[model samples]
Target: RMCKTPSGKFKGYCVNNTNCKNVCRTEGFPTGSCDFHVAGRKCYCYKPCP
Candidate 1:
């Protein structure tokens, strides 16, 4: 489970799961879009405003 730190830093989970991928997809966002990494897990989302 990825979450934000008290200092506003993003934290990533060490599990190698695609939960973020599915979440982003379900939220109408593309997977592997967010540029965030922590521990071993990464958060993904759709491209920002173009």
Candidate 2:
């Protein structure tokens, strides 16, 4: 699942991957990929390319 940062709340996905990773270095979350949920079922958060 993907979520954006709430205004003035730059804690999570709000910061882009590059910026976040660069600053925090191993202290950020990973951008998950679309995966199956159920029996061959298709699922995708397809969130903003972080």
Candidate 3:
């Protein structure tokens, strides 16, 4: 299975999933998704872990 890691580059409420995904890609993650956090919406990168 895959795992999620929060993107530090993301700030404020995430309004666009596309933008989130794009940002995650720049960080070298394979993929990403916008998730609802306890504080606010944010971007999370998806990848496989060892």
Say which prediction, candidate 1 or candidate 3, comes out ahead on TM-score: 3
Looking at model 3, residue 23 earns an lDDT score of 80
- List the candidates ranked by TM-score, beginning with the highest: 3, 1, 2
Candidate 2 or 1, higher TM-score: 1
- The sequence of per-residue lDDT tens digits that candidate 3 reaches over residues 1-50 is 67798987876666777777778888888877889875778899888897
Ranked by lDDT from best down, the candidates are: 3, 1, 2
- lDDT comparing candidate 3 with the true structure: 0.80
Q: Please count the clashing residue pairs in each candidate, in the order shown.
A: 0, 0, 0
* TM-scores, all models, native as reference: 0.36, 0.22, 0.75
Q: Which residue runs does candidate 3 get wrong by more than 4 Å?
A: none
lDDT of each: 0.43, 0.33, 0.80
Cα displacement (angstroms), candidate 2, residue 16, comes to: 26
Where does the lowest 10-residue lDDT sum fall in candidate 3?
Answer: 10-19
Give one digit per residue, the lDDT tens place, for model 1 in 1-50. Answer: 33322211224542432555555656564443333345555555543453
Model 2's number of clashes is 0
Tens-place lDDT per residue, model 2, 13-47, is 42244544332333343432223344542222223
